[PDB]
PDB file of C-alpha atoms in Angstrom:
ATOM      1  CA  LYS A   1       9.360   8.095   7.560  1.00 31.85           C
ATOM      2  CA  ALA A   2      12.898   9.444   6.992  1.00 31.18           C
ATOM      3  CA  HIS A   3      11.773  10.390   3.453  1.00 31.58           C
ATOM      4  CA  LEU A   4      11.164  13.961   4.634  1.00 30.69           C
ATOM      5  CA  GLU A   5      14.813  14.003   3.616  1.00 32.04           C
ATOM      6  CA  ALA A   6      12.714  15.136   0.583  1.00 35.19           C
ATOM      7  CA  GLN A   7      11.403  18.205   2.490  1.00 35.74           C
ATOM      8  CA  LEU A   8      14.942  19.061   3.711  1.00 36.50           C
ATOM      9  CA  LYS A   9      16.251  18.729   0.145  1.00 35.51           C
ATOM     10  CA  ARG A  10      13.568  21.174  -1.073  1.00 36.12           C
ATOM     11  CA  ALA A  11      14.032  23.679   1.790  1.00 31.38           C
ATOM     12  CA  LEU A  12      17.830  23.451   2.152  1.00 28.98           C
ATOM     13  CA  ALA A  13      18.222  24.080  -1.612  1.00 28.20           C
ATOM     14  CA  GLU A  14      16.447  27.459  -1.322  1.00 26.91           C
ATOM     15  CA  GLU A  15      18.411  28.496   1.809  1.00 28.59           C
ATOM     16  CA  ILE A  16      21.589  27.915  -0.223  1.00 26.74           C
ATOM     17  CA  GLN A  17      23.069  31.334  -0.876  1.00 24.50           C
ATOM     18  CA  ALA A  18      22.592  32.448   2.099  1.00 20.44           C
ATOM     19  CA  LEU A  19      26.010  31.217   0.862  1.00 20.10           C
ATOM     20  CA  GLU A  20      27.626  34.000  -1.191  1.00 18.51           C
ATOM     21  CA  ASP A  21      31.150  32.923  -2.066  1.00 19.27           C
ATOM     22  CA  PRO A  22      32.457  33.930  -5.521  1.00 19.82           C
ATOM     23  CA  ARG A  23      35.165  31.219  -5.477  1.00 19.62           C
ATOM     24  CA  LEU A  24      32.576  28.380  -5.185  1.00 21.64           C
ATOM     25  CA  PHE A  25      29.513  30.048  -6.804  1.00 20.78           C
ATOM     26  CA  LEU A  26      26.079  28.455  -6.443  1.00 20.48           C
ATOM     27  CA  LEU A  27      25.845  25.627  -3.974  1.00 21.47           C
ATOM     28  CA  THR A  28      23.586  22.848  -5.295  1.00 24.35           C
ATOM     29  CA  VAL A  29      22.022  20.034  -3.242  1.00 25.45           C
ATOM     30  CA  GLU A  30      22.408  16.697  -5.018  1.00 22.87           C
ATOM     31  CA  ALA A  31      20.737  14.567  -2.304  1.00 22.35           C
ATOM     32  CA  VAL A  32      19.739  14.308   1.324  1.00 23.12           C
ATOM     33  CA  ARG A  33      19.771  11.236   3.575  1.00 26.82           C
ATOM     34  CA  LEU A  34      18.090  11.195   6.977  1.00 26.15           C
ATOM     35  CA  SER A  35      18.559   8.508   9.650  1.00 27.59           C
ATOM     36  CA  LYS A  36      15.663   6.244  10.713  1.00 23.93           C
ATOM     37  CA  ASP A  37      15.315   8.120  14.032  1.00 24.39           C
ATOM     38  CA  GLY A  38      15.021  11.453  12.146  1.00 19.48           C
ATOM     39  CA  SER A  39      17.975  12.680  14.244  1.00 18.51           C
ATOM     40  CA  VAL A  40      20.730  13.192  11.652  1.00 16.48           C
ATOM     41  CA  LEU A  41      20.838  14.394   8.075  1.00 15.23           C
ATOM     42  CA  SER A  42      23.593  14.221   5.465  1.00 17.44           C
ATOM     43  CA  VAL A  43      23.549  16.913   2.771  1.00 15.21           C
ATOM     44  CA  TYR A  44      25.354  15.993  -0.433  1.00 16.80           C
ATOM     45  CA  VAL A  45      26.047  19.505  -1.717  1.00 15.70           C
ATOM     46  CA  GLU A  46      26.850  20.015  -5.498  1.00 14.58           C
ATOM     47  CA  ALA A  47      29.203  22.761  -6.784  1.00 12.88           C
ATOM     48  CA  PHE A  48      31.027  23.782  -9.947  1.00 12.60           C
ATOM     49  CA  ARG A  49      34.237  24.777  -8.101  1.00 11.69           C
ATOM     50  CA  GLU A  50      35.535  23.982  -4.616  1.00 11.48           C
ATOM     51  CA  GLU A  51      36.484  26.852  -2.397  1.00 13.12           C
ATOM     52  CA  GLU A  52      37.733  26.560   1.194  1.00 14.15           C
ATOM     53  CA  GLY A  53      35.249  29.160   2.533  1.00 14.68           C
ATOM     54  CA  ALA A  54      32.188  27.374   1.020  1.00 15.68           C
ATOM     55  CA  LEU A  55      33.460  23.996   2.343  1.00 14.53           C
ATOM     56  CA  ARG A  56      34.271  24.854   6.013  1.00 14.70           C
ATOM     57  CA  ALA A  57      31.879  27.898   5.942  1.00 15.79           C
ATOM     58  CA  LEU A  58      28.987  25.464   5.477  1.00 15.78           C
ATOM     59  CA  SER A  59      29.950  23.777   8.764  1.00 14.33           C
ATOM     60  CA  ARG A  60      30.426  27.165  10.496  1.00 19.65           C
ATOM     61  CA  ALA A  61      26.986  28.240   9.196  1.00 20.31           C
ATOM     62  CA  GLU A  62      25.293  24.933  10.211  1.00 18.76           C
ATOM     63  CA  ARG A  63      23.557  26.316  13.345  1.00 21.84           C
ATOM     64  CA  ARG A  64      22.080  29.213  11.356  1.00 20.26           C
ATOM     65  CA  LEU A  65      21.071  26.831   8.521  1.00 21.65           C
ATOM     66  CA  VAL A  66      19.278  24.531  10.989  1.00 19.81           C
ATOM     67  CA  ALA A  67      17.429  27.583  12.405  1.00 18.87           C
ATOM     68  CA  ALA A  68      16.247  28.413   8.844  1.00 19.19           C
ATOM     69  CA  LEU A  69      15.144  24.787   8.280  1.00 19.92           C
ATOM     70  CA  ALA A  70      13.206  25.005  11.597  1.00 16.47           C
ATOM     71  CA  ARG A  71      11.321  28.032  10.416  1.00 16.68           C
ATOM     72  CA  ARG A  72      10.731  26.702   6.881  1.00 18.75           C
ATOM     73  CA  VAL A  73       9.560  23.225   7.871  1.00 17.48           C
ATOM     74  CA  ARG A  74       8.103  23.942  11.345  1.00 14.62           C
ATOM     75  CA  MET A  75       9.585  20.726  12.768  1.00 11.10           C
ATOM     76  CA  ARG A  76       9.691  20.177  16.521  1.00 10.11           C
ATOM     77  CA  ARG A  77      13.120  18.507  16.255  1.00  9.59           C
ATOM     78  CA  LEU A  78      15.443  19.573  13.522  1.00 10.43           C
ATOM     79  CA  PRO A  79      17.996  16.924  12.554  1.00  9.36           C
ATOM     80  CA  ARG A  80      21.688  17.623  13.076  1.00 12.63           C
ATOM     81  CA  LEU A  81      23.228  18.397   9.684  1.00 10.39           C
ATOM     82  CA  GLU A  82      26.515  17.431   8.033  1.00 13.72           C
ATOM     83  CA  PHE A  83      27.726  18.522   4.570  1.00 12.29           C
ATOM     84  CA  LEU A  84      29.431  16.041   2.229  1.00 10.99           C
ATOM     85  CA  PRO A  85      31.378  16.833  -1.024  1.00 13.08           C
ATOM     86  CA  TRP A  86      29.039  17.036  -3.909  1.00 18.46           C
ATOM     87  CA  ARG A  87      28.908  14.168  -6.095  1.00 16.38           C
ATOM     88  CA  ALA A  88      32.072  13.459  -6.335  1.00 17.70           C
ATOM     89  CA  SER A  89      29.541  11.402  -8.384  1.00 20.18           C
ATOM     90  CA  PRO A  90      30.083  11.484 -12.144  1.00 21.76           C
ATOM     91  CA  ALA A  91      28.244  14.213 -14.039  1.00 20.68           C
TER      92      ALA A  91
END
């Protein structure tokens, strides 16, 4: 039932920017994977240009981002979130 990775992909995409960093621009969500126990999520973020602030700032802003997911999805237990470099998949 860890396909609500689909709901997190939908909702986390919109919450993006929140993130306003001119050196990285728009932060895109390429994919989301959620563990079988619905406890952890991995967010494969997509961007045109890497910037330090939008890398590490995503991890600093994780608690706030989870709070926004909570509100958007109305889950009892929001998965812990980690951000992974977009792609680096060919595009």
